[PDB]
C-alpha cells in the first residue's frame, strides 16, 4: 500500500480544512483507516480512526466534536474534516492502515503526511 | 409472581444435575415453562420446554438424549435434569415462562459448574514492578468461584481493577486484582482475599 | 434450526443517539422477539411479535421487519439501554436465539497504560512462574498483547482476561498472564510484553 | 339470569382491578374469572389468583403489571361454578393516577401557570384543569393537552383561586373516556 495525504495548507484559527488519504495497492473495504498527528514540539498523537462502514468512527479527546472521519470505499479514500481549528492543531498529519481486520491497531503501512498550520 | 430456582451446584463430569424452578403468583399448569442455558460469556441457548398441564416436553435436538424436563402441579415446581455432565455444560440455567406473549417471566438462573477439581484455597502472590504505579495480588489455584478481593480492608476503591477469573488448564481458577496508586505514595498496600468455599482469608502485603 | 445472525457484534454509541440492531434468519419467521440482558441479570423481554412493546418497556424501543430481516431501534440511548440484546424466533421448532449484540458506550480513544509484573519469589519456590502484563484504562476494547520471551514469540503460554466497561469512565482494563515452569523461566533472561492498540502509533513494549 | 358485567379498570398501567356485582344472584355463588388475550402465544386461559372478596363472596380480581398488555384484546370470562365473555381494549380502560405536586407559578401579575407532575407518561395523558373562585362557584373547565402547563392570563390577587386537575388516557396512546380522580385542590 502507498498511502498519500493531500489537502494540507495554512488556515486561519476557527477555520475548516479537509484532508484526504488515498490508498494505492490494497482495497480499504476490509481494514480500519487511522489519522495521526505529530506536532513539531511533540510526539505522534492519535487523532481519529474510521473503521469499516457501520463499525463506527472513533476520535481522540482533543478532536472530539470538531473533526470527522469520512470513508469513501469506492475511491479507496479516507477524509478528515477539521472545524474550529486551533493553533494547537498545527502539526503534520499522517495516515495509517490497520492491517488487522479485528482492529488491534496493527499499523504497517504509513503515509507521507501533510503539514497543517493554523 | 416469581420463578425461584435452586442454588448453584458444583458437579463432576459424568454425573447429573437437577435444577428446580418453583413458580409463585400463578398456576404452573397455566403456562409453558422453557429451559434456556447461557454459557459463561456466551449467548442464550434454548434447551427444552414443558406444558405442565399435560406433562408433554419438547427438547432441543442438542440435548434430546440427555435432558429431561418434568413438572409437579401439586407443588407448582418444574425440574430440568441434565445427565452425562461435561465441562461444556458449565452454564447458568434459566427457567422462563410463557404466559401471554414471549418469555414473559424468567428465573434468576442456577449456575452449574462442571469440573473434576475439588475445593482448594487460593494462593495469593504479590504483583509488584510513570507518576502512577500499579500494584496487584495474583489469586491462583482456587476452586470454586468466587474469590472476594479487597484492598486495605475497603480503603482502596478508586483504581482497583479485579479481573474475571480464567479457568486454568489444570481445572483451577486464577484472577488478578490490580490497584493503581501514585508512585510517591509507595503508604502500605494490602490485598485481602476471602475464599468462603474453602474458608480461607489471606492478607498479603504487596 | 433457523440460525439468527445479529449485527453488529458490538454497537458502540454515545448516549442520546439512535441504535439499530439487525437480526437476519436463514429461513422466514413469522415474528421476532427481543430480549435485554444486563450483566449479572436474567434476560428481559422488550419486543414481542416483531413490533409490540413488552410490559414496562419505554417508548424509545421499536421493532420492525419481515421474512428474514428484522430490526430493533432505540430512538434515544440512555445509560440503562447499554446491554446485550437477543433476537428470538418461535416460528420453527426448536426456538433459537441470536448470538447477541452488546450495546457499548462510545467514548474517546484512550491508549492502554501498560505495566509488567515479574513472578514473586514465593511462586518460584512453589515451582511455577507467572508474568503479568496489565493494560489500564483503554478504549476501544480491541487490543493485542503478545509475549516476546528473549525476543521469541510465545504462543499457547498466555491467558487474557478483560474487565467490563468501567462505570465511571467507560474504559477497559486487560490482564495477560504468562505461565511457565521454573526451569523454563530460568532458561531465558528477558521477558517482554508488546501491546498494539488503535490509539497507539507504535506498539508499546514493557520488559524486565 | 344474565351474569353480572365485569368492569375492568387499569390504573396507571400498574394494576388492573376487575369487579362484578355478585349480589344480584339470589344464591351467593363464588363466580370464577378466566382471562386471556386474543392471538396470544399461549392458548391456555389464565385463572384468577388475586381474588377480591366482598360480603364473603368473590367481587372481583386484580392483575399485576406484567399481565396488562395494552393495544391487545383482553378477553374476560365470568364462569358460574353459564358464562359471560367480555372483549375489552385496555387502552380505553386505563385510569391514570391523579396529578401530583400541583404548583402555581406567578409569571406575571395577571398570569398564573399551573404545573403538575403526573405519575405516568405525560404525552399519553390529556389533563382537565378546573379552577374555582369565591364568586365563581362553578368549576371552570379548560382541557389541556399533553403539555402539562395551564397558563391563565387573567387572574385576580384578591380572588382566592382554587385549582384541581384530572388526567385521562387520551387521545395519543388510547381513547379512554374515564377521567382520573381529582387531585388535591391547591389554593392561591
Amino acid at each position: 500500500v502507498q498511502l498519500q495525504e493531500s489537502g494540507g495548507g495554512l488556515v486561519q484559527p476557527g477555520g475548516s480544512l479537509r484532508l484526504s488519504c488515498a490508498a494505492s495497492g490494497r482495497t480499504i473495504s476490509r481494514y480500519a483507516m487511522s489519522w495521526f498527528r505529530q506536532a513539531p514540539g511533540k510526539e505522534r498523537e492519535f487523532v481519529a480512526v474510521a473503521r469499516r462502514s457501520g463499525d463506527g468512527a472513533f476520535y481522540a479527546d482533543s478532536v472530539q466534536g470538531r473533526f470527522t472521519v469520512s470513508r469513501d470505499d469506492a475511491k479507496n479514500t479516507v477524509y478528515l474534516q477539521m472545524n474550529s481549528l486551533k493553533p494547537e492543531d498545527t502539526a503534520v498529519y499522517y495516515c495509517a492502515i490497520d492491517s488487522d481486520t479485528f482492529y488491534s491497531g496493527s499499523y504497517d503501512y504509513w503515509g507521507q503526511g501533510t503539514q497543517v498550520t493554523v | 409472581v416469581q420463578l425461584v430456582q435452586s442454588g448453584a451446584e458444583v458437579k463432576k463430569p459424568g454425573s447429573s444435575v437437577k435444577v428446580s424452578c418453583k413458580t409463585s403468583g400463578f398456576n404452573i399448569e397455566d403456562i409453558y415453562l422453557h429451559w434456556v442455558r447461557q454459557a459463561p460469556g456466551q449467548g442464550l441457548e434454548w434447551m427444552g420446554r414443558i406444558d405442565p398441564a399435560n406433562g408433554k416436553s419438547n427438547y432441543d435436538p442438542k440435548f434430546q438424549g440427555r435432558v429431561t424436563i418434568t413438572a409437579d402441579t401439586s407443588t407448582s415446581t418444574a425440574y430440568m435434569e441434565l445427565s452425562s455432565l461435561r465441562s461444556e455444560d458449565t452454564a447458568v440455567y434459566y427457567c422462563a415462562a410463557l404466559r401471554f406473549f414471549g418469555l414473559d417471566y424468567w428465573g434468576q438462573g442456577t449456575l452449574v459448574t462442571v469440573s473434576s477439581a475439588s475445593t482448594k484455597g487460593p494462593s495469593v502472590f504479590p504483583l509488584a514492578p510513570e507518576s502512577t504505579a500499579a500494584l496487584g495480588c495474583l489469586v491462583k489455584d482456587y476452586f470454586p468461584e468466587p474469590v472476594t478481593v479487597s484492598w486495605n480492608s475497603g480503603a482502596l476503591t478508586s483504581g482497583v481493577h479485579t479481573f474475571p477469573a480464567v479457568l486454568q488448564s489444570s481445572g483451577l481458577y486464577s484472577l488478578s486484582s490490580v490497584v493503581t496508586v501514585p508512585s510517591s505514595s509507595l503508604k502500605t498496600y494490602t490485598c485481602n482475599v476471602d475464599h468462603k468455599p474453602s474458608n480461607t482469608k489471606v492478607d498479603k502485603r504487596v | 434450526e433457523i440460525v439468527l445472525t445479529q449485527s453488529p457484534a458490538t454497537l458502540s454509541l454515545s448516549p442520546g443517539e439512535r441504535a439499530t440492531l439487525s437480526c437476519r434468519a436463514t429461513s422466514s419467521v413469522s415474528y421476532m422477539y427481543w430480549y435485554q440482558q444486563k450483566p449479572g441479570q436474567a434476560p428481559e423481554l422488550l419486543i414481542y411479535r416483531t413490533s409490540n412493546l413488552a410490559s414496562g418497556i419505554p417508548a424509545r424501543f421499536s421493532g420492525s421487519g419481515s421474512g428474514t430481516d428484522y430490526t430493533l431501534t432505540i430512538s434515544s440511548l440512555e445509560p440503562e439501554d447499554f446491554a446485550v440484546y437477543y433476537c428470538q424466533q418461535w416460528s420453527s421448532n426448536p426456538p433459537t436465539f441470536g448470538q447477541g449484540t452488546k450495546l457499548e458506550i462510545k467514548r474517546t480513544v484512550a491508549a492502554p497504560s501498560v505495566f509488567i509484573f515479574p513472578p514473586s519469589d514465593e511462586q518460584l519456590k512453589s515451582g511455577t512462574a507467572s508474568v503479568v502484563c496489565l493494560l489500564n484504562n483503554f478504549y476501544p476494547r480491541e487490543a493485542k498483547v503478545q509475549w516476546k520471551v528473549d525476543n521469541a514469540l510465545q504462543s499457547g503460554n498466555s491467558q487474557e482476561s478483560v474487565t467490563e466497561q468501567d462505570s465511571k469512565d467507560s474504559t477497559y482494563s486487560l490482564s495477560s498472564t504468562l505461565t511457565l515452569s521454573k526451569a523454563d523461566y530460568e532458561k531465558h533472561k528477558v521477558y517482554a510484553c508488546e501491546v498494539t492498540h488503535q490509539g497507539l502509533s507504535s506498539p508499546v513494549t514493557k520488559s524486565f | 339470569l344474565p351474569l353480572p358485567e365485569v368492569q375492568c379498570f387499569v390504573f396507571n398501567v400498574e394494576y388492573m382491578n376487575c369487579t362484578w356485582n355478585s349480589s344480584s344472584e339470589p344464591q351467593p355463588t363464588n363466580l370464577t374469572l378466566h382471562y386471556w388475550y386474543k392471538n396470544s402465544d399461549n392458548d391456555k386461559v389464565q385463572k384468577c389468583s388475586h381474588y377480591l372478596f366482598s360480603e364473603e363472596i368473590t367481587s372481583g380480581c386484580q392483575l399485576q403489571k406484567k399481565e396488562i398488555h395494552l393495544y391487545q384484546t383482553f378477553v374476560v370470562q365470568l364462569q358460574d361454578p353459564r358464562q359471560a365473555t367480555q372483549m375489552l381494549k385496555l387502552q380505553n380502560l386505563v385510569i391514570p393516577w391523579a396529578p401530583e405536586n400541583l404548583t402555581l407559578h406567578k409569571l406575571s401579575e395577571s398570569q398564573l401557570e399551573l404545573n403538575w407532575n403526573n405519575r405516568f407518561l405525560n404525552h399519553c395523558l390529556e389533563h382537565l384543569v378546573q379552577y374555582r373562585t369565591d364568586w365563581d362557584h362553578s368549576w371552570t373547565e379548560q382541557s389541556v393537552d399533553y403539555r402539562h402547563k395551564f397558563s391563565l392570563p387573567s387572574v385576580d390577587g384578591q380572588k382566592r383561586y382554587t385549582f384541581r386537575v384530572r388526567s385521562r388516557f387520551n387521545p395519543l396512546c388510547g381513547s379512554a373516556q374515564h377521567w382520573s380522580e381529582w387531585s388535591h385542590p391547591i389554593h392561591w
Side-chain angles (χ1 to χ4, degrees), chain B residues 31-32 51 99-100 102 104, chain D residues 35 41-42 44 66-67:
Chain B
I31 73 179
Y32 281 92
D51 177 2
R99 181 177 181 170
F100 312 104
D104 291 345
Chain D
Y35 55 89
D41 300 301
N42 199 32
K44 284 142 46 171
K66 260 202 214 190
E67 320 184 39

Side-chain angles (χ1 to χ4, degrees), chain D:
Chain D
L1 287 185
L3 278 173
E5 172 199 0
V6 184
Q7 288 258 357
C8 311
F9 277 139
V10 191
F11 301 99
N12 224 66
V13 175
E14 292 164 358
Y15 65 89
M16 196 190 326
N17 287 2
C18 324
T19 54
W20 54 84
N21 196 5
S22 43
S23 178
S24 59
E25 300 281 354
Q27 315 167 0
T29 308
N30 263 332
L31 287 189
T32 63
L33 192 66
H34 297 165
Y35 55 89
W36 66 98
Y37 286 92
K38 279 211 312 181
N39 310 302
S40 56
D41 300 301
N42 199 32
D43 49 355
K44 284 142 46 171
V45 311
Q46 302 302 316
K47 293 179 179 179
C48 165
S49 292
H50 192 151
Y51 262 114
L52 314 165
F53 287 92
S54 176
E55 308 167 0
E56 290 279 358
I57 208 72
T58 46
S59 93
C61 189
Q62 160 156 341
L63 289 83
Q64 293 310 125
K65 183 178 179 180
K66 260 202 214 190
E67 320 184 39
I68 304 165
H69 291 276
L70 314 182
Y71 326 113
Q72 303 256 20
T73 326
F74 195 49
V75 200
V76 152
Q77 181 177 352
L78 217 30
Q79 187 67 263
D80 185 8
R82 185 171 182 239
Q83 47 173 296
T85 296
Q86 307 184 184
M87 283 180 131
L88 305 163
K89 274 286 164 173
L90 307 178
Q91 64 180 20
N92 310 305
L93 299 169
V94 171
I95 291 202
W97 291 135
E100 192 181 2
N101 297 338
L102 268 63
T103 289
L104 288 148
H105 303 85
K106 203 172 181 180
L107 311 175
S108 177
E109 302 179 359
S110 64
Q111 303 173 0
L112 263 175
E113 191 194 0
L114 172 59
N115 292 339
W116 51 91
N117 293 57
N118 41 4
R119 310 162 205 177
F120 187 79
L121 311 171
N122 46 65
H123 48 99
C124 296
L125 296 182
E126 154 212 10
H127 321 278
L128 173 59
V129 175
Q130 267 187 0
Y131 49 99
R132 186 175 71 91
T133 289
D134 40 301
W135 304 326
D136 310 60
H137 294 270
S138 61
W139 285 90
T140 314
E141 300 179 353
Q142 294 300 320
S143 64
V144 183
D145 70 302
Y146 77 97
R147 303 169 184 180
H148 52 91
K149 292 176 178 179
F150 159 77
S151 60
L152 194 53
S154 178
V155 311
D156 189 8
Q158 314 168 1
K159 288 183 175 185
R160 214 178 71 77
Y161 274 88
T162 311
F163 298 85
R164 63 173 181 179
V165 175
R166 66 174 178 180
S167 299
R168 192 170 66 176
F169 202 72
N170 199 62
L172 177 63
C173 308
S175 64
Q177 297 309 302
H178 311 89
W179 284 101
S180 64
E181 301 80 23
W182 286 111
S183 286
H184 314 91
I186 57 169
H187 306 266
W188 187 278

Side-chain angles (χ1 to χ4, degrees), chain C residues 89-104:
Chain C
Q89 61 105 10
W90 268 352
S91 295
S92 209
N93 274 10
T96 294
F97 289 85
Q99 70 285 0
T101 287
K102 182 211 169 114
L103 191 66
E104 207 216 39

Side-chain angles (χ1 to χ4, degrees), chain A residues 33-96:
Chain A
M33 294 300 293
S34 309
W35 288 85
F36 285 81
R37 78 179 164 192
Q38 194 171 2
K42 293 180 181 179
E43 306 174 0
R44 191 162 299 179
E45 166 207 358
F46 176 84
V47 169
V49 50
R51 295 190 170 180
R52 284 191 295 272
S53 301
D55 270 335
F58 301 85
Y59 305 91
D61 197 4
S62 53
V63 312
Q64 182 77 5
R66 303 179 305 172
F67 292 25
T68 305
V69 277
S70 295
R71 187 180 180 82
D72 193 1
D73 278 356
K75 300 181 185 177
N76 274 1
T77 310
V78 172
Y79 310 89
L80 179 61
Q81 180 69 218
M82 331 185 223
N83 312 302
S84 306
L85 279 164
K86 301 178 186 173
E88 71 171 4
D89 272 298
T90 296
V92 184
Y93 282 69
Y94 296 140
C95 160

Side-chain angles (χ1 to χ4, degrees), chain B residues 130-193:
Chain B
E130 311 181 2
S131 62
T132 306
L135 296 181
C137 56
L138 178 63
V139 187
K140 194 177 179 179
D141 294 354
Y142 68 88
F143 192 87
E145 290 180 352
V147 154
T148 278
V149 200
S150 302
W151 281 92
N152 293 1
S153 303
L156 295 174
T157 45
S158 60
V160 178
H161 307 276
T162 299
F163 296 88
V166 296
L167 180 62
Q168 285 154 193
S169 58
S170 62
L172 304 166
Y173 288 91
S174 181
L175 70 88
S176 185
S177 183
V178 178
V179 80
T180 299
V181 291
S183 59
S184 62
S185 69
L186 298 186
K187 178 175 179 180
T188 61
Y189 296 101
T190 302
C191 164
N192 321 141
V193 167

Side-chain angles (χ1 to χ4, degrees), chain B residues 6-79:
Chain B
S6 58
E9 313 196 7
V10 182
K11 288 285 184 176
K12 302 231 163 323
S15 62
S16 307
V17 55
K18 177 133 136 163
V19 186
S20 67
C21 176
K22 171 148 208 343
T23 74
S24 55
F26 50 73
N27 289 284
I28 178 81
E29 63 185 342
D30 289 345
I31 73 179
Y32 281 92
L33 205 89
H34 303 235
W35 279 98
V36 171
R37 89 154 154 215
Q38 200 188 6
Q42 267 192 270
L44 295 170
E45 215 272 312
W46 187 80
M47 307 185 60
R49 163 183 40 185
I50 187 182
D51 177 2
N54 299 359
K56 316 190 127 213
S57 310
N58 289 337
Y59 304 121
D60 174 53
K62 182 182 316 177
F63 313 93
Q64 204 156 357
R66 304 167 53 234
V67 67
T68 299
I69 305 174
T70 60
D72 207 326
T73 36
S74 33
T75 42
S76 294
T77 206
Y79 313 98

